[PDB]
Amino acid sequence: TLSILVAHDLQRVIGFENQLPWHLPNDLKHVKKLSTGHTLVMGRKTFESIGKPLPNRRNVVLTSDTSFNVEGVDVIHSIEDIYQLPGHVFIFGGQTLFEEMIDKVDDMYITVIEGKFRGDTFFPPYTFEDWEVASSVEGKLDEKNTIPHTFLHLIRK
Ligand SMILES: NC(=O)C1=CN2[C@@H]3O[C@H](COP(=O)(O)OP(=O)(O)OC[C@H]4O[C@@H](n5cnc6c(N)ncnc65)[C@H](OP(=O)(O)O)[C@@H]4O)[C@@H](O)[C@H]3O[C@@H]2CC1
Ligand SMILES: CCc1nc(N)nc(N)c1C#CCc1cc(OC)cc(-c2ccc(C(=O)O)cc2)c1
Incomplete structure (x- = not known):
């Protein structure tokens, strides 16, 4: 399976x-x-x-840098390489990779952050007309989690 994994806010900010x-x-x-x-x-x-x-999983980094080498990281140099990766593969970021992969993935695990943050990095626009909601689970608020958030699993129609 090829999936997107992303957290974005109400205006699709993912980073600043x-x-x-x-x-x-x-x-x-x-x-x-x-x-x-x-x-x-x-x-x-x-x-x-x-x-x-990140520990206990395969970490694959896409770069044009032929010198790039980090222990614990596997390097690929082309988008086409992603499709040769075995098992459940999650596209993890950032804006550029998401833009390249959103029309290719099977499904998306989205955390919608119910706030409006200043950002410089965005998830691409998508429409629920193209995606079925497999599940939608509200996150719990508490001492250490103080912004409302919802976990969506969307599957391409
Ligand atoms: N929550 C997130 O996912 C976050 C992501 N980080 C942000 O990405 C912000 C904007 O840069 P963005 O271009 O979206 O970065 P990503 O796609 O990770 O990385 C881009 C790099 O991937 C590589 N590029 C992506 N597509 C290809 C490709 N098709 N072939 C070869 N390389 C790939 C290429 O690396 P290279 O310059 O070393 O060659 C490209 O510049 C950047 O400012 C990073 O800060 C945020 C923190 C939050
Ligand atoms: C963890 C945030 C996140 N949530 C969801 N649902 N999908 C994603 N794709 C990312 C992501 C990402 C990239 C990223 C950027 C970054 O820049 C500072 C930090 C992290 C990050 C931070 C903490 C942890 C951790 O403590 O487990 C892991 C990743 C992760």
Whole structure:
């Protein structure tokens, strides 16, 4: 399976100045649950924003840099390489990769952050006319998760 995995706000912001604009531990756990034991594919800038590979899953970075080498990271150099990756593969970021892959993926796991943040990085527009809602689960608010958020699993019609 090829899936998108993304958290975006009400205006599809996903990033600002190399950071996630919000602090939502529930969503980090969501990502850990979905992608542990599987594969994340991300563009070079997203990887550098993170700074290191995420544990207990395959980390694949897409770059044109033939010198790029990071222990624990597998490098690919073309979009076509993604399709040769075995198992459940999650397109993880950023804006550029999402723009390249949104018309190709089977389904999307979206965390909708119910706020309006300043951003410089955006998920591409999509329409629910093209996507069936397999599930929609509101995240719980608490001490450490203080912005409303909803977990969507959308499947291409
Ligand atoms: N929540 C997120 O996903 C976040 C992502 N990070 C943001 O991405 C922000 C905007 O840059 P963006 O172009 O969207 O970055 P991504 O696609 O990760 O990475 C772009 C890089 O992937 C590579 N490029 C993507 N498509 C291809 C491709 N088709 N072939 C070869 N390389 C790929 C290429 O790397 P390279 O310059 O080292 O060659 C390209 O410049 C950038 O400012 C990063 O900060 C945010 C923090 C939040
Ligand atoms: C974790 C945020 C996130 N949520 C969902 N649902 N989908 C995604 N694709 C991303 C993402 C991403 C890229 C990214 C950028 C970044 O720049 C600072 C940081 C992270 C990040 C931060 C914390 C953790 C963690 O503690 O588990 C993991 C990734 C992750």
